[model samples]
Target: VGLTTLFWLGAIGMLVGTLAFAWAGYYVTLVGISGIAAVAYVVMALGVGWVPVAERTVFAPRYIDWILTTPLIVYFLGLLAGLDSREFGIVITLNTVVMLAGFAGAMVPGIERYALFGMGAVAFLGLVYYLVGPMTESASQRSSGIKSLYVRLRNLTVILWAIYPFIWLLGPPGVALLTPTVDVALIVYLDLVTKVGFGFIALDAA
Candidate 1:
């Protein structure tokens, strides 16, 4: 019961928080597109509550939401880091593949799911390597004030994104260490941070 309450509270908080980020972004001349994406991600998060679960698994909907939205976040950070169009495209494309592989893992049945999960995990690691290696090094070279805010926000975004794959391993289609209720609560909290909190930081940095 408490987990249920926590779940709804986090969901509602996510919606409201994202609305605030979009609203605040309106006044800022920078990071405008990222603000719009922030709203879009929360729109997806809002649907998670209504998604029904069967046999400890929920399918199609939430992953669909994630597949559409996670790249927006990476793209947002890419822009904040002043990445060139080519670099931005690489980040978005890599993250999209990661999410797509994860979605496939969620939708597929049986042992095949584990195979897709392994593929997605590999893609995620590749993304991390691109980010921590070339991406950061490039951004650092470009921005004299990089440490003033952007790098910290990028770190926060990276941390949140890194936690999500592990979170999935603990939930449906994974090991099922968490009850469905606790899973939703925990995922919502992480979503709030990654989507909503990350958006706020980007807007402020802009």
Candidate 2:
């Protein structure tokens, strides 16, 4: 039930996303649009789990989902933060560097791998600076409920995301410390938590 659980999680994600989208009031607001991202995330999850589309793509299906998904998460955060489109563009762009770089690091070997990862880590630093600092400031300036939900959402995002790199570092890509099953399992679990779990909370904001 290791990777099979990933397939089941895809079904669960499907349900969560359907629920979110159905409740979206057809996305007159940003709320329902989030459901699309939620569903989009697990489409790749299903790909990775069921299709085992790892070797076929230049970018692994796992990273491909994240490349598409995390931007949606951050953009939703920016919405709650009352961010201007141009400002939020920076947040999403900076984040893309990390996921892309992380994938690059995973694919390469030796010094170049670590170097790409280090570049990703620096991008992460820049991302956190914006999220925790400027993003928080903007969120706080909103009225009471927006402010409250923004804080909760922002905090949830950063904390959950912070776990990813350590797993990456500990698992197959960075070192030989973990079996591939364990590595895939942990990351898939994290994806479930971040996308499906956070999807409900994001729905609550809507």
Candidate 3:
């Protein structure tokens, strides 16, 4: 099961990587291919059976994403198959939100981190604010503190420093090992490189 899962995931990864390389810019080159890959993954992950019988017949359980399938699969496997007593399902649910949002973009530099965090925080804070709307004003103020400037800066320092790759040149260029003329550090270069080719881009904005 592990091997097969890994194989398919790797294939999907390669497909995405190739498409990214081909048209990393604002182009929809592999929409169809990507859709196919997504469908394939959904089908393979039919373990999550959350939809109703009629809904399943209509949508096909295999035609959804993990974000939707995880809960269903967890219930089915927990109740029916007794798979890992639902612990695995719980972990998967929590980790999916964690890894997708903060973990991956943690490597990005500067404002990108804040941008990503802000977008995520909107959904989170909205949920919190909605739930705690009935509470006292002081409570609401405290919850707002969760996303204060201090926390943002703190997250920036720790997260960016930790995740961003550090590149260093040792012993000067074309020199021996363990001796360095200049040690230059590299951040996760969001370095957006752009070029115009085959008249793809407009020469003058008309």
Candidate 4:
């Protein structure tokens, strides 16, 4: 019941986050991406059922949803970071591959699982290098307000994303400190906070 309550809270958070940014009129892409995340949260809540899974829950739908959304976050950040269209497209593509690699880590079993995690880690490092290196440098050259906002968003992105792999370690594919029910609930809350909260910061800045 606690996890169920959390799911509903996550859905509500996504809904409110969407409406908040949607009305901000700072940018259309932000509104659109947040709307998509709102829909993803609803689908996730419904598919996850009122109770937990019988065994290790994959929550494949959530992974699929992130396949669409996570790259968008990078894309949006790339925009603020002033990445050119071609460079932005490359980073987005690389990130998509890395995210899928992470999903693969969860899907596979045995030693191969950690192998995939390693691969994803390497790719994520590449992505981070690009963001922190070229992207940050570009953003630093922008107006003072834009520079300030960009730095904030970049830090937020790093902080939120850094926790995801740890959650994976604690959840399905790893140590499992929490049960499936609690694990899903925590992931939902993280998603709501990172995705919606990220947009709130970005749109407010915009």
What TM-score, over all chains together, does every model reach? 0.79, 0.81, 0.19, 0.88
Candidate 2: worst 10 consecutive residues by lDDT? 50-59
Candidate 3 Cα deviation (angstroms), residue 91 = 16
lDDT of every model, 2 decimals: 0.65, 0.71, 0.31, 0.75
Greater TM-score among 2 and 4 belongs to: 4
Candidate 3 deviant stretches above 4 angstroms: 1-99, 133-206
Off by more than 4 A, model 2: 26-59
Q: What are the per-residue Cα lDDT tens digits for candidate 1 across 114-148?
A: 78888878888888877777777667755566544
| 1-206 per-residue lDDT for model 4 (tens digits) | 76556656777877787787767763666666666766756766676522233345566666677788888788778877787888987788779878898778777766687788878778888888888888899888788998888888788887778788878888767765768777877688778767777887876665
Candidate 2 lDDT, tens digit per residue, 89-111? 89999999999998888777565
Clashing pairs for model 3 are 48-73, 49-73, 171-179, 171-180
Q: What alpha-carbon RMSD in Å does predicted model 2 have with respect to the real structure?
A: 3.8
Instruction: Kindly report which residue stretches of model 1 are placed more than 4 angstroms away from their true locations once superposed.
Output: 2-7, 26-54
> Candidate 1 clashing pairs?
none
Each prediction's RMSD to truth? 3.8, 3.8, 23.1, 2.6
TM-score of 2: 0.81
